[PDB]
Amino acid sequence: GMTETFAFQAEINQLMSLIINTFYSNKEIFLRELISNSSDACDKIRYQSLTNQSVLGDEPHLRIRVIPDRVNKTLTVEDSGIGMTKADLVNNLGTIARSGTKSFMEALEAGGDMSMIGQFGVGFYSAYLVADRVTVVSKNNEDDAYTWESSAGGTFTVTSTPDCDLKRGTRIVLHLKEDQQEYLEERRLKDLIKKHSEFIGYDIELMVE
Ligand SMILES: COc1c(C)cnc(Cn2cnc3c(Cl)nc(N)nc32)c1C
């Protein structure tokens, strides 16, 4: 089946090349980065709803949910936030992140700590510290539902998903690397949500059973 595939922009391509298959002592920070993004997406739609309540549509509840899949060996971070359009997935996010991507790359070449990735506005990419593939399913009010996917080899796919569960928001599926399986464990995820994301202004829903 024909899948639309794109080459990442120079700076992102170089940043992902840096992140993958590298030792780091605090790879657990990926969770804080994805939850903060989800909190921000929820805040954007909450803000839009203050002027136009119709923006909430059939999904009036704002949540952040963490789903470990012990059979598929995946960790999912899903929210009912603003979501992303096709143009966001393909170009717009990379355009706004460009300067910060180049600046973080420069900090990393200088011995910079990977934990400050979020201050550079490219925190999503920390998912590649623990995953070898990331699938991103997103539905924004202004577009159809789309699936973005990448194994950080320089390319990414973008496919329309006109049959996904999502009324609005983003679902990030982390296909965990063989040695990063600890992020599927209930205690680890509880301790991790508590350690770095305790006072997030939305419940961090952890699928326990
Ligand atoms: C598609 O994959 C992404 C890319 C290539 C860059 N940044 C983000 C972070 N990000 C940007 N907007 C986002 C929204 Cl609306 N929501 C969430 N959860 N993450 C977001 C994502 C998920």
Numbering used by the authors: 0 to 208
Paper passage:
Among the chaperones, heat shock protein 90 (Hsp90) – alternately referred to as Hsp83 or Hsp86 because of the variable molecular weight amongst different orthologues – is a hallmark of the stress response at the cellular level, and a major component of the eukaryotic proteome. Its main function is to serve as a molecular chaperone helping nascent polypeptides avoid mis-folding and limiting protein aggregation during thermal stress. Although the compounds represent diverse chemical scaffolds with unique properties, they all inhibit the enzymatic ATPase function of the chaperone by binding the ATP pocket in the N-terminal domain (NTD), which together with the middle and C-terminal domains define the highly conserved Hsp90 protein architecture.
The other crystal (compound 1 complex) was a primitive monoclinical with two copies per ASU. It is composed of a modified halogenated purine moiety linked to a pyrimidyl ring. The purine moiety showed a hydrogen-bonding pattern already seen in the adenosine-binding pocket in other Hsp90 structures in complex with ADP or ATP mimetics. Conversely, the pyridyl group occupied a modified phosphate binding pocket not seen in the nucleotide bound structures and dominated by non-polar interactions, including an aromatic π-stacking interaction between the pyridyl ring and the side chain of Phe123. The modified phosphate-binding pocket was composed of the following residues Met83, Leu92, Phe123, Tyr124, Val135 and Trp147. The elongation of helix-3 at its C-terminus joining with helix-4 into a single helix, created this modified pocket.
